[PDB]
Amino acid sequence: RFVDDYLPALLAQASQLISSEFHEVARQHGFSVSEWRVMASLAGSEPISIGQLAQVTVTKQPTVTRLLDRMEARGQVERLPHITLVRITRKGLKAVEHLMELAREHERRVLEPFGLRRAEELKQTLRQMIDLHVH
Amino acid sequence: RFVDDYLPALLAQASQLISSEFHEVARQHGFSVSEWRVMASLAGSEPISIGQLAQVTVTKQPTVTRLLDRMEARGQVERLPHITLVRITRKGLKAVEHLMELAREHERRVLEPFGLRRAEELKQTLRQMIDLHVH
Numbered sequence: 436r437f438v439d440d441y442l443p444a445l446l447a448q449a450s451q452l453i454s455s456e457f458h459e460v461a462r463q464h465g466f467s468v469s470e471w472r473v474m475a476s477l478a479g480s481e482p483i484s485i486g487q488l489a490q491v492t493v494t495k496q497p498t499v500t501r502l503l504d505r506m507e508a509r510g511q512v513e514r515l516p517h518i519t520l521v522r523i524t525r526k527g528l529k530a531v532e533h534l535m536e537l538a539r540e541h542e543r544r545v546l547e548p549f550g551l552r553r554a555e556e557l558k559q560t561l562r563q564m565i566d567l568h569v570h
Numbered sequence: 571r572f573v574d575d576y577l578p579a580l581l582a583q584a585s586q587l588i589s590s591e592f593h594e595v596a597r598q599h600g601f602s603v604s605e606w607r608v609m610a611s612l613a614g615s616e617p618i619s620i621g622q623l624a625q626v627t628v629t630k631q632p633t634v635t636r637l638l639d640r641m642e643a644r645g646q647v648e649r650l651p652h653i654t655l656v657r658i659t660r661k662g663l664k665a666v667e668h669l670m671e672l673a674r675e676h677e678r679r680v681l682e683p684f685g686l687r688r689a690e691e692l693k694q695t696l697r698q699m700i701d702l703h704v705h
């Protein structure tokens with residue numbers, strides 16, 4: 436059956452199922468999905484462009500702009516001129532650091548049954564695919 | 571940097587980038603994303619439940635119900651009693667079969683740089699992850 440082996444369908448189902456699990460934790464800790472993606476993507480990062488942030492958070496750029504309006508109002512991120520760059524603030528980092536710990540724990544549980552070899556192979560393949568297909 | 575290696579972010583970016591490429595082709599051939607996912611998921615399949623279809627198409631069940639209302643009106647799918655099951659009709663299969671050929675061609679181009687070993691490993695890992703995390 437086509438869909439059983441079709442790569443884009445497999446990627447999309449695996450992604451939705453694993454992410455939905457962690458999104459429950461994120462909401463339990465007062466975060467929306469979009470807030471979690473923005474703060475976790477900026478944590479430990481150099482300032483990046485709005486376009487880069489939109490790509491990594493898989494969010495449309497106009498949606499990201501509205502999101503940054505309100506996250507900047509709450510002091511969690513800051514927009515800078517270089518093209519507009521964006522960074523997480525210390526307030527945002529302190530707000531998200533425990534959640535990032537929990538995210539790493541959840542990821543470890545998801546990948547443990549596969550073993551280190553298969554887990555690293557999966558992550559490397561995904562990184563290579565992103566770098567080939569990004570615009 | 572957290573996000574560079576975080577599995578759910580990697581899965582979601584790879585999935586969005588590869589799928590967006592094929593969605594362009596689907597629209598060029600008169601299909602919406604949701605129509606493509608439903609018809610391709612049902613092609614060659616036994617009738618499946620609305621809940622199963624919602625999971626495989628990564629679409630919320632109420633959205634799927636509205637989608638099936640209009641796809642059934644166009645004669646592309648049919649809802650049956652067993653729990654409601656759903657199948658593709660011959661009209662729907664004829665409408666989507668060429669697009670499925672093009673989808674297989676696009677998938678082959680996406681996976682060719684990785685080689686058969688890495689491609690099969692990726693697909694097997696994704697299938698195993700889906701089967702572990704589905705509800």
Ligand SMILES: O=C(O)Cc1c[nH]c2ccc(O)cc12
Nearest residue numbers: 443444447589607610626627
């Ligand atoms: O839209 C995409 O590429 C991702 C996707 C998720 N579920 C699907 C089921 C069938 C299909 O053809 C594609 C998909």
Ligand SMILES: O=C(O)Cc1c[nH]c2ccc(O)cc12
Nearest residue numbers: 454472475491492578579582
């Ligand atoms: O929401 C998800 O699990 C998927 C996702 C896509 N891009 C992200 C960037 C950072 C992050 O923590 C998660 C994600």
